[PDB]
Each structure stands twice: as structure tokens, then as C-alpha cells.
């Protein structure tokens, strides 16, 4: 009659977790490991305690040039990343162009802190009117204004003497210098603002050899103006010196930027705003708080992040094929 | 199943064996109960843990996208940049998804073969001292106290000890 028995078998449980294989989908297993992070907090937070630089409605150009509507960013502290909207409304209040703009923003994505210094004081213009260069395209508190960091110089007593100003970068750090040129509408306005009919702006450093010349043309009125302002920049190295010579149309430097902290940063394109939180990984859609090796939130992240993948599901089978 | 054990000649799993992936259920007349094989289950946990760490480690050199900006007259290189980044993202998504599929299949077959090897181990231990019921069970041709139960669970079963009582009952059943 039936002898003793011993049977060999395997684990089953209440598990409903499903994994996929090449030959079979939706296979229930006793044990799985989800390895895909699908959740974020929907907020722009500090990165490891350092607060980002949220530019709100101002672009990078409006920030560094000093668009009057960007006074919130007159002297920003050290940041962890920069946030800029897709189409900021406060860009070039006076219409024009920003030469080599994208290369400058690339430079930006490796700087963590600027230190603004006055290299050419607006006071020191004795032979020119340094306080008339204002416009209604750049308004501030109901009265015409202009970019705070550059000086729109005007003739003084129907005279525009030949400016020859030099600045020698005596600091220890690289110095981001910005300047500009005016393109008026006609020779009338040209003489009205600068007296001299054919003008120029020579800029020189150890590697820069530039001579701008104003281009006059009738153009469409943007923000009221048909004239244009075209801005240029360079990185003046320590012990090097920049030289400006001009007889008109000069948008002189006043403040420049000392690059005092470098490191890994980014210009993140996001419509969100500061969310008063902290994270170790930030995306333009929200911060991530996860131990998982993967995520599917956004490809552009900063911090100690999971690796991004486009999948909606990524689950490893650890246990057995689970019996019903 | 590639090895025919899990959901094969062993048709279902044991909800009652709660502290092991593989193991035994004995039924002598001292009683009956479940006992997990912890050497095999721990070997399998070692393998699965090393597999998980292998996948995750191989994925830490994966492509990281970078924001780049271009102006209205740089549409060719902006398009080039976008397709470069999207191509690397598609490549690494393919890598992750496909590695997960393949290693899931191989993990299930790994558990299957672990069960099969356990069964073969005790079958080779017992030999003709037991009838092979064909469902993962062995009917002993002798009587097995709760301690030769552990003797077959720890791999130290003495065939010549019960050789001729098993041969007793084998000759009996043959007539």
C-alpha cells in the first residue's frame, strides 16, 4: 500500500507582476523589479542646495545687456543651472541682432557665477552726452530708457569727437565684454545723433581686429523703431586689453562680467517657475527623486540622474513563472 | 519551458512553500510538510542579483543628451544635431528593451533548469529504491523517517542502507 513520498516543486504566490519575453508577452512572475522611473514632482527646484537662475520673461540677451524690464537680474548670485522660457517676451527691447549669440549661450552653459564690474563709467564721458540715449521701445516706469549695461552715446554741442578708450583687464578672471553699434534710418537721423556722416567703430584686443560701419536702410518698425542695434561681445583674458575707437554710432560698454566660477551648468528651456524645493536631478518638466536606473521623463536633465529611455515600461523578471 | 520542469511534468507551483523558490514536500507517516532548499535558492538569488547589477552597470555609459541652440540660418546643423541625439536615444532604448526581453527569457529558463536539476539530483540519489511517479514525486520502496527526508534534502542519502528492503518490496510488487 502507498509508501512514503517526497515531491520536488517550486514557489507560487499572489503576484500579478508581468514581464515580457521574445516569445511571449504579459507573463506573470512571482517576483519582478521595475527599473523605470515614470514620476516627477512638476517643480523647478535647487540642484544640491544651489538655486538655479530663473530668467522668467527675460532672455539671456535681455539679462546680460540689461533690458530695463530685467532689473530682477541686475546682480544674480551663483546658480546651478539657468532656466529660460521658449520665447521670452523681454529680449531686445530696441530691435536688432546679437552677434554670435548661440556661441555665447554655449559659453554660458559652463559658467556658474558672473561678477559685474564697471569698466567704463557712464560719468567719464565729458565730450559726449552719455545720458540722452533713450527710447520708447525700451521703457521703464513710463519714461524712455535703454539697456542698463551699455551706454548709447550722443553728440554734445553738434560735436562727436573721436573716442579712443582702452580697458586693460587687470583682474585674474576672464571678462565678458559687450558693446554695440547703431544702424539709423537715414542720413538725417545719422547727423542728428552723431553729426559725422560716415562713422565707424574699431575694436581691438590680442586676437580681435574688428571695424564695424553703420548700415543705413529703411526697415519695418519693430517695437516702434526702424533703427537697429547690433551687439557684439568677446572674452578679454587677464592682462590683455581691449581698445575702442569710434566717431559715432557707438554703444559703449559700461558694465562687464567677471567669470568667477566655472563648472557644469545648462540653459534649460522650461515654462515652469521656481517651486521652492530641492533635488539631485532636474528636468524641464520636474525634479526626479528615484533610485531606479532608468527614467522616461525628458532627455535633457542635470544632476545625478537615471539614464533616459523612451520606453513606457521596463520590468525585469527576477522570480519564476507564477502559477494561477 | 525550455527544460520541461516548471509547468511541465511538475504542473503547478506551491503556495505553501513560502520561504524558498525551489524545495521539497515530504509525506511520510510521521507527517507531511514543505521545506525549502536554501542552497539552490540562494545560488539562484546570487545569479539573479549579479544579472541585475550587470544590466545596470552596462547601461551607465549610455548616451546623455545635451541642449544646443542654433539660429535661423543654421537649420542644417540644427537638424543634424536633433537627428544625432534622437538616434543615440533610439539606440540606447533598443539596447535596454532588447536586453530586458532576452534576459527575462533566460531568467525564466534558468529557474526551470534549477527545478529540473534538483529533481534529477534526488532521482539519481534514490535510484531503484523508489518509484518515479512522473509528476515530480517519488514513492519510496521503503520507509523514510523525517531524517532520511533531510538526508535526501542535504544530498547524503545512503542507497546501500535500504538497498535490500527496497529490493524486498520491489520483488513483492513484481508478484
Amino acid at each position: 500500500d502507498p509508501g512514503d513520498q517526497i515531491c520536488i516543486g517550486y514557489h507560487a504566490n499572489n503576484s500579478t507582476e508581468q514581464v515580457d519575453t521574445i516569445m511571449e508577452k504579459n507573463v506573470t512572475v512571482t517576483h519582478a523589479q521595475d527599473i523605470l522611473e515614470k514620476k516627477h514632482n512638476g517643480k523647478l527646484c535647487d540642484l544640491d542646495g544651489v538655486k538655479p537662475l530663473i530668467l522668467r520673461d527675460c532672455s539671456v540677451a535681455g539679462w546680460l545687456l540689461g533690458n530695463p524690464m530685467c532689473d530682477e537680474f541686475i546682480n544674480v548670485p551663483e546658480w546651478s543651472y539657468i532656466v529660460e522660457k521658449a520665447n521670452p517676451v523681454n529680449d531686445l527691447c530696441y530691435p536688432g541682432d546679437f552677434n554670435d549669440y548661440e556661441e555665447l549661450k554655449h559659453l554660458l552653459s559652463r559658467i556658474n557665477h558672473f561678477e559685474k564690474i564697471q569698466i567704463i563709467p557712464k560719468s567719464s564721458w565729458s565730450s559726449h552726452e552719455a545720458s540722452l540715449g533713450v527710447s520708447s521701445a525700451c521703457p521703464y516706469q513710463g519714461k524712455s530708457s535703454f539697456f542698463r549695461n551699455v551706454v548709447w552715446l550722443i553728440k554734445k554741442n553738434s560735436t562727436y569727437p573721436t573716442i579712443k578708450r582702452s580697458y586693460n583687464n587687470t583682474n585674474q578672471e576672464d571678462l565678458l565684454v559687450l558693446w554695440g553699434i547703431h544702424h539709423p534710418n537715414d542720413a538725417a537721423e545719422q547727423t542728428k545723433l552723431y553729426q559725422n556722416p560716415t562713422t565707424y567703430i574699431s575694436v581691438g584686443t590680442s586676437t580681435l581686429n574688428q571695424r564695424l560701419v553703420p548700415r543705413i536702410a529703411t526697415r519695418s518698425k519693430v517695437n516702434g523703431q526702424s533703427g537697429r542695434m547690433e551687439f557684439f561681445w568677446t572674452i578679454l583674458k587677464p592682462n590683455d586689453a581691449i581698445n575702442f575707437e569710434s566717431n559715432g554710432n557707438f554703444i559703449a560698454p559700461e558694465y562687464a562680467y567677471k567669470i568667477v566660477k566655472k563648472g557644469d551648468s545648462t540653459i534649460m528651456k522650461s515654462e515652469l517657475e521656481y517651486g521652492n524645493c530641492n533635488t539631485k536631478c532636474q528636468t524641464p518638466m520636474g525634479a526626479i527623486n528615484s533610485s531606479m536606473p532608468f527614467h522616461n521623463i525628458h532627455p535633457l536633465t542635470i544632476g545625478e540622474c537615471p539614464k533616459y529611455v523612451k520606453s513606457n515600461r521596463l520590468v525585469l523578471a527576477t522570480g519564476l513563472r507564477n502559477s494561477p | 519551458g525550455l527544460f520541461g520542469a516548471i509547468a511541465g511534468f511538475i504542473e503547478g507551483g506551491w503556495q505553501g512553500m513560502v520561504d524558498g523558490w525551489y524545495g521539497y514536500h515530504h509525506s511520510n507517516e510521521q507527517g507531511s510538510g514543505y521545506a525549502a532548499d536554501k542552497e539552490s535558492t540562494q545560488k539562484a538569488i546570487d545569479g539573479v542579483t549579479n544579472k541585475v547589477n550587470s544590466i545596470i552597470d552596462k547601461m551607465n555609459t549610455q548616451f546623455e543628451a545635451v541642449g544646443r541652440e542654433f539660429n535661423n540660418l543654421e537649420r542644417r546643423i540644427e537638424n543634424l544635431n536633433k537627428k544625432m541625439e534622437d538616434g543615440f536615444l533610439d539606440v540606447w532604448t533598443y539596447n535596454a528593451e532588447l536586453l530586458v526581453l532576452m534576459e527575462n527569457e533566460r531568467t525564466l529558463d534558468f529557474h526551470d533548469s534549477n527545478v529540473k536539476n534538483l529533481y534529477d539530483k534526488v532521482r539519481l540519489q534514490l535510484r531503484d529504491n523508489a518509484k518515479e511517479l512522473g509528476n515530480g514525486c517519488f514513492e519510496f520502496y521503503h520507509k523514510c523517517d523525517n531524517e532520511c527526508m533531510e538526508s535526501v534534502r542535504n544530498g547524503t542519502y545512503d542507497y546501500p542502507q535500504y538497498s535490500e528492503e527496497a529490493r524486498l518490496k520491489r520483488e513483492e510488487i513484481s508478484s
Binding site: 514557489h11 523589479q33 527576477t318 | 524558498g20 525549502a36 536554501k38 535558492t41 540562494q42 546570487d46 542579483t49
Partner: peptide
């Protein structure tokens, strides 16, 4: 609870043999 039958750092057997 506060002890397990197995060395399971990643929890690939989640709960099996922990008491």
C-alpha cells in the same frame, strides 16, 4: 521581520524568507 533566510541586497525575492 528584522531577519532573512537569504542574502538578498536588491530584493530579487522580495519578502521570501524574511520574518
Amino acid at each position: 521581520x528584522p531577519v532573512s533566510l537569504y542574502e538578498d541586497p536588491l530584493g530579487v525575492a522580495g519578502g521570501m524568507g524574511v520574518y
